[PDB]
């Protein structure tokens, strides 16, 4: 003789797609418009609650990718376009053991459209192509797309950004230690806003990322599949020091009526190759821990070998950085050059490229202007993106090489601890009730 | 005694405008923009109810017009601008039963600002005028056009307009509807049916067919200035094609932007035209004149002449087929008199278009490779009546070249938007217990 | 005993801010964004109510300024820009003041591959030497200016601000309101009275007169940097007009683009000027000093001096009428001293103007056919207090400017937005039963 009863506000949530909004305390992301967040990110634990987390199929990664792309395109819209920069450039080698930097001289307009002006600007070999000791050269973006330049007033500091779910939704935080990618989280909590995530930009490695609280972990849909990248997280970050003692000079040229252009002037002192340093003992220990976990996953008595990139575009086969205004490109072949069975420092050569297409898009590049004085890019690695080959029937030995190609993996390593769930406060259950007329 | 009561959710409707929205299943009218329409729309049929309809003062047609031009501008904004195309063009003739096509050459920039290149392209005499051998583009003294990108297509994907919550769309399913007046058989549907936003003058292509016979609808039959709409109960197939095999060659107008110019013409050169069987047209015209006589009375003869005069778009049948905007001379079809083999329509192509009859947003459609050949259904007409004197025992009709409002109204004539009023009060033998 | 009681819709409000929507009845101040206003003013008097007012910290001026900036940008953006005008100018002195310069320069025509020599007249304030013959347009080294779009005009149409649902606006109906203090007589109205967005500096034109006597407002008179606002109790008529009627020339710089330059002058060239009744101005100044003596004491010497220095925008009086922007030297109206038939003020014209003193957002004002006369009357002033460490009993004031918000702050001081709190609680001897 039971009777159904209606209850409201009961704890029930279901996974679903939704849109989030920014929250934080000028930058390209223009955080000034982000609604301020409270200084007390209240977190409530959920005892006796277990939920299944699938970070590989999570939607927040796509949301972050689209949001970051939208902000990047919006911030560069008001900046001065360089459509007239596509002209015949007569370059010559700059005098000093690289033979890469070129001294280009070209024509340009000025405040008045009826008269031109002769100027010069240094351009790296990666930003010019031959179009048939002086020869004619053209920018690589002329036959692809005429893009603007980042306004110097805006900075690229990866300041943290907090994502807060809207009303009627909630975010579940999986605090369980040693929790891999897909699996049930024994201990989960709820937070209205996610922790400060730095939208860093890098390839083959993670900079200023989250650190493991117990030990190095490996995440992948199934390591048996070679078409899936491998995400690595370090419990002890390794310091990395990048710099370029060149002291480039800034040359301000007014290409039009209010259109200012920042060219690369003559170099002061001596030209030195842009390199990066990193401790060797720490790297060896980290590699040892990584191979230990890899052996535990692939089985004991397995040979692990680390090799460099397997070739491709300079964007994926190199190490991308974002500090000082320009984007470095280091050759990481010096790190993945060891095999594991059973005061020293390493120098990584790096190049410079102003025109970039980091988003892998076709039709919209970005011109990074230079800055004055020496640049000290201090950071620490926190993760790696490795890929493994098939290896044929030979399974006793396996090889891992740096990955790259999908920018979503960068932010995916930081969003694996959260998930979006739609609250359903409506429920029905039986009880001995009976309404009175 | 009696006491009043309040009822919630009562069925009531009133005429009122509302912000409607689309619903649908690389195109000007983005199909993904519209919310995914219900695969099986639920159409509820009423009973013992009547409603007044006014397809002339209806606001859905105005909303359709506003949305169409807004989407047009939105689609043309991302495409490249043809500002540098305004250059002196030393041009000559092409060597055919026509000499209209012109082989013009002109200096032009390339990927490098400093460098310049010399290229040639074919142009039609309809959008080329002599500046003084020397020719230019007519759009130069009006506004800079924006060539439609090749990815975006002009195919007319059907669009299902739908009303938001709290509103309803009343569909008049009564046969032989008079256009304006009470509709004894109406129905309510959450979202309208498939409507193809096809643009066409004089002749309506891919339209809706009548139920019983040919219908005639006009604001005032006695008024000559106002246009008269016609709808056929059967379709009249029309075949239009361009026998010229066009070749497309890309030219780098600027950094990252390419210009699509008419490469050349291979083989013989023939004039574009349309084909329509004279028997079907004869029968359709016979039914049309019979329906016209029903309103104008018996013992009255009717004539069908060509356009009175004016611009090319308003005096010729204009339509799109595979991206090519046609302009055919329909004088041959509207040539007959009623008392008591296939026809060929001489047609010409125009690359510069000024759709919606508004300046400042001209288009430069790009050429299409291969041979264009598309079939269409002729379902309605836009007729115009000239001034008379005592009716002269005869009336003359011409194909009107009005704007697209009539074109879109011919398909939405059986629809109207109303606002629901769920609040009602009625008496009842009740007293609120204290 | 007693129990708490819940009351809804209680009339309680608190200070807050909200985004108010515009509302009004070919003008940059009004478009489709502003909804129609209610002809009947829904003003309700509040008896026994007393609320503090602070017109200095109020956010009304901030929101108004932001919305107006958005409107100005949204109005200048829809049409042609003057970026190619930044070229070398060849000027020669005119001969039947001595300011206008007959400048000539090269400019393209309808076709981007040709040039047409044109000439136009530009004021000395709109050009700068490169040499004595060559000249360059001002602001070309900072940004590209935009011409006043001809379809729209600068008529100061009244604007009515209405708070949204849930908010309210309190109006201080009591007279002798000194700006910051309690207002015993307050009234509420969902829509403020007519507000004139006329732009001006130093002097306030087409404003609202005082209640019964001259008013003096400032944050706190015991300061120098902070400006002081003065409102007249009676209107002072003022006339302004330039006898020279420029001739507009249609010059096309590109496809669908053309700028209106100043043609040859007809007749004799005479400098622009303004007129004001000396008697009325003297009486107004007498009343102003009389009211100032109340705060500064009696037997004090009050003197007036012209602007000290700075750019032309702050050191001169601006206007907005008929598309012509003026910059007059009002030193003659602030050159009097007090103890214990008309005045003429020279004026100059300038086309390129930095309206909101925004670097890189210059705007070009095109001329207008025929003579232009702008009849209006002054209503307030924006002065600045200067002096020593009370070493002398003489007070000196100078006209102010720059703070565009202060211009409109003298009109919004009569309103304050508040947030309603319909939730309230009170004690009562009531207990809920089962």
């Amino acid at each position, epitope marked *: 003789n039971l009777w159904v009863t209606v209850y409201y506000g009961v704890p029930v949530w279901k996974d679903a797609e939704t849109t989030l909004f920014c929250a934080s305390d000028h930058n390209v992301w223009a955080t000034h418009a982000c609604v301020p967040t409270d200084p007390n990110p209240q977190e409530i634990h959920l005892e006796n609650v277990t939920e299944e987390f699938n970070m590989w199929k999570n939607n927040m990664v796509e949301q972050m990718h689209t949001d970051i792309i939208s902000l990047w395109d919006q911030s560069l819209k008001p900046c001065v376009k360089l459509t007239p920069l596509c002209v015949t450039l007569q370059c010559t080698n700059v005098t000093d053991m690289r033979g890469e930097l070129k001294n280009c001289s070209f024509n340009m307009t000025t405040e008045l459209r009826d008269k031109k002006q002769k100027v010069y600007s240094l351009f790296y070999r990666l930003d010019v192509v031959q179009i048939n000791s002086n020869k004619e050269y053209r920018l690589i973006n002329c036959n692809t797309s005429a893009c603007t330049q980042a306004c110097p007033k805006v900075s690229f500091e990866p300041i943290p950004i907090h994502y807060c779910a809207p009303a009627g939704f909630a975010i579940l935080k999986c605090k369980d230690k040693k929790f891999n990618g897909t699996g049930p989280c024994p201990s989960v909590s709820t937070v209205q806003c996610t922790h400060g995530i730095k939208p860093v930009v890098s390839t083959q490695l993670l900079l200023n990322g989250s650190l493991a609280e117990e030990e190095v972990m490996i995440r992948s849909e199934n390591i048996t599949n070679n078409a899936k990248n491998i995400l690595v997280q370090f419990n002890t970050p390794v310091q990395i020091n990048c710099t370029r003692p060149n002291n480039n000079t800034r040359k301000s040229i007014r290409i039009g009526p209010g259109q200012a252009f920042y060219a690369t002037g003559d170099i002061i002192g001596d030209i030195r190759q842009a390199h990066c340093n990193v401790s060797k003992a720490t790297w060896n220990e980290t590699l040892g821990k990584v191979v230990k976990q890899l052996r535990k996953h692939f089985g004991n008595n397995t040979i692990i070998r680390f090799a460099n990139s397997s070739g491709g575009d300079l964007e994926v086969t190199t190490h991308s950085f974002n500090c000082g205004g320009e984007f470095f490109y280091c050759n990481t072949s010096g790190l993945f050059n060891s095999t594991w069975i059973s005061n020293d420092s390493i120098t990584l050569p790096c190049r410079i490229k102003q025109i970039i297409n980091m988003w892998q898009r076709i039709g919209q590049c970005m011109y990074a202007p230079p800055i004055q004085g020496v640049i000290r890019c201090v950071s620490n690695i926190t993760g790696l993106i490795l890929t493994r080959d098939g290896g044929s029937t030979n399974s006793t030995t396996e090889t891992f090489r740096p990955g790259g190609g999908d920018m979503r993996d960068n932010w995916r390593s930081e969003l694996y601890k959260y998930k979006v769930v739609k609250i359903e406060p409506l429920g029905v259950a039986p009880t001995r009730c009976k309404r009175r007329v | 005694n009696l006491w009043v009561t309040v009822y919630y959710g009562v069925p009531v409707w009133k005429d009122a405008e509302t912000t409607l929205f689309c619903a649908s299943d690389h195109n000007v009218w983005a199909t993904h923009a519209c919310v995914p329409t219900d695969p099986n729309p639920q159409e509820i049929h009423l009973e013992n109810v009547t409603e007044e309809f006014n397809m002339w003062k209806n606001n859905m047609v105005e909303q359709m017009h506003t949305d169409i031009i807004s989407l047009w501008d939105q689609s043309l904004k991302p495409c490249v601008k043809l500002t540098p195309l305004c250059v002196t063009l030393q041009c000559t003739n092409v060597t055919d039963m026509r000499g209209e096509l012109k082989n013009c050459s002109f200096n032009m920039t390339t990927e490098l600002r*400093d460098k310049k290149q010399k290229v040639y392209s074919l142009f039609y005499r309809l959008d080329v005028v002599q500046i003084n051998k020397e020719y230019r583009l007519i759009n130069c003294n009006t506004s800079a056009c924006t060539q439609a990108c090749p990815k975006v297509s002009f195919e007319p994907i059907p669009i299902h307009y739908c009303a938001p919550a709290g509103f309803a769309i009343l569909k008049c399913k009564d046969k032989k509807f008079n256009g304006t007046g009470p509709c004894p058989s109406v129905s309510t549907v959450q979202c309208t049916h498939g409507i193809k936003p096809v643009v066409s003058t004089q002749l309506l292509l891919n339209g809706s067919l009548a139920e019983e016979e040919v219908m005639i609808r006009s604001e005032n039959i006695t008024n000559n200035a106002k246009n008269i709409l016609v709808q056929f109960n059967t379709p009249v197939q029309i075949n239009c094609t361009r026998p010229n095999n066009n070749t497309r060659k890309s030219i780098r107008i600027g950094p990252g932007q390419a210009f699509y110019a008419t490469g050349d013409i291979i083989g013989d050169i023939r004039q574009a035209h349309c084909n329509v069987s004279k028997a079907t047209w004869n029968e359709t015209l016979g039914k049309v004149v019979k329906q016209l006589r029903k309103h104008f009375g018996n013992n009255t003869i009717i004539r069908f002449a060509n356009s009175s005069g004016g611009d090319l778009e308003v005096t010729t049948h204009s339509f799109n087929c595979g991206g090519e905007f046609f302009y055919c001379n329909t004088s041959g079809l509207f040539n007959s008199t009623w008392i008591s083999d296939s026809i060929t329509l001489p047609c010409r192509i125009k690359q510069i278009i000024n759709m919606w009859q508004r300046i400042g947003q001209c288009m430069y459609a790009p050429p299409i490779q291969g041979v264009i050949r598309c079939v269409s259904n002729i379902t309605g007409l836009i007729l115009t009546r000239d001034g008379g004197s005592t009716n002269s025992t005869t009336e003359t009709f011409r194909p009107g070249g009005g704007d697209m409002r009539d074109n879109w109204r011919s398909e939405l004539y059986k629809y109207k938007v109303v606002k629901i009023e769920p609040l009602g009060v009625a008496p009842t033998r009740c007293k609120r217990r204290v | 005993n007693l129990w708490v009681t819940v009351y809804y819709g209680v009339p309680v409000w608190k200070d807050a801010e909200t985004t108010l929507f515009c509302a009004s009845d070919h003008n940059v101040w009004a478009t489709h964004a502003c909804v129609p206003t209610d002809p009947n003013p829904q003003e309700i008097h509040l008896e026994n109510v007393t609320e503090e007012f602070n017109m200095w910290k109020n956010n009304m001026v901030e929101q108004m300024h932001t919305d107006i900036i958005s409107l100005w940008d949204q109005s200048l953006k829809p049409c042609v820009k003057l970026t190619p005008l930044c*070229v070398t100018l060849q000027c020669t002195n005119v001969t039947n003041r001595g300011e206008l310069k007959n400048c000539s320069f090269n400019m393209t025509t309808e076709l*981007r591959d040709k*040039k047409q020599k044109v000439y136009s007249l530009f004021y000395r304030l709109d050009v700068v030497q490169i040499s004595n013959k060559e000249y360059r347009l001002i602001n070309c080294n900072t940004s590209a200016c935009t011409q006043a779009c001809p379809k729209v005009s600068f008529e100061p149409i009244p604007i009515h601000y209405c708070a949204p649902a849930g908010f309210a606006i309190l109006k201080c109906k009591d007279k002798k309101f000194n700006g910051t203090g309690p207002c015993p007589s307050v009234s509420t109205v969902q829509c403020t009275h007519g507000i004139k967005p006329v732009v001006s500096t130093q002097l306030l034109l087409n404003g609202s007169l005082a209640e019964e006597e001259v008013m003096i407002r400032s944050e706190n008179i015991t300061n120098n940097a902070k400006n002081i606002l003065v409102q007249f109790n009676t209107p002072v008529q003022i006339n302004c007009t330039r006898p020279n009627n420029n001739t507009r020339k249609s010059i096309r710089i590109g496809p669908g683009q053309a700028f209106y330059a100043t043609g040859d002058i007809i007749g004799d060239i005479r400098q622009a000027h303004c007129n004001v009744s000396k008697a009325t101005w003297n009486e107004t100044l007498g009343k102003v000093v009389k009211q100032l003596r109340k705060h500064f004491g009696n037997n004090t010497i009050i003197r007036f001096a012209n602007s000290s220095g700075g750019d032309l925008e702050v050191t001169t009086h601006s206007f907005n009428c008929g598309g012509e922007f003026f910059y007059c030297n009002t030193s003659g109206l602030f050159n009097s001293t007090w103890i214990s038939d008309s005045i003429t003020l020279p004026c100059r014209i300038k086309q390129i103007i930095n309206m909101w003193q925004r670097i890189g957002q210059c705007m070009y004002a095109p001329p207008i056919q025929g003579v232009i006369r702008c009849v209006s009357n002054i209503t307030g002033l924006i002065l600045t207090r200067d002096g020593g460490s009370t070493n002398s009993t003489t007070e000196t004031f100078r006209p102010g400017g720059g703070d565009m918000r202060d211009n409109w702050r003298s009109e919004l001081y009569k309103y304050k937005v508040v947030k309603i709190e319909p939730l309230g609680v009170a004690p009562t001897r009531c207990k809920r039963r089962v």
Partner: antibody
Amino acid sequence: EVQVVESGGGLVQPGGSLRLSCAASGFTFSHVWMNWVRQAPGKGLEWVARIKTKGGAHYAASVKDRFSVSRDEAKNTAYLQMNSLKIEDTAVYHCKVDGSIVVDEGFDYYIDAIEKGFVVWGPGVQVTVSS
Amino acid sequence: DVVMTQSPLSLSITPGQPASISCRSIQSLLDSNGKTFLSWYQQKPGRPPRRLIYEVSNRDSGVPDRISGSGAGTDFTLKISRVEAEDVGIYYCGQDSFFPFTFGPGTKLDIK
């Protein structure tokens, strides 16, 4: 019309030295390159030296280690200096220069043009190697 | 040096018929790119020289069109359809294809 100015003339003793000069004006001249040719008495012309004033030098057969040349842009002139004169050096010097007067300076990128200048000829110096 | 020879050394004709003159070089004057710098000069008595034809055939603004020239490789010549009184003067041939310039000895053209 383009003009040329001849200067630096005089009388030189056998084996002496002097200073030559020339100038031009009236136009922009764009890419102009000066030359130096002399006509011996009763015999044809003969190249002397070369100066690429605007934009490389070239010396004739019998002028090495005897003639040093210079250029100018503010004035567009050139400064010539010789030494160790001989009897054969007695000849009339004509300021030879390949003129390239620009025309209708391109105010945009659709009008650039050059007049294809003329080779201006100098009047004559009539340098005599005698007392 | 690239020496060249002229021909005829002297000439004299009455007005009413055409005339011609040739100037050969020791070797081909064509450079690597392909352009030629063959110049024809005219120097009337008492005044400096004046050019008439440039790059073998082209004509300099101010020169009568009746004067025309052509050639290829090593053989070059000048052709005039009608000689007038103003044509009286000394005729020269010149080339600047190579750095060491060479100018012809000079030919006399007298008119009755």
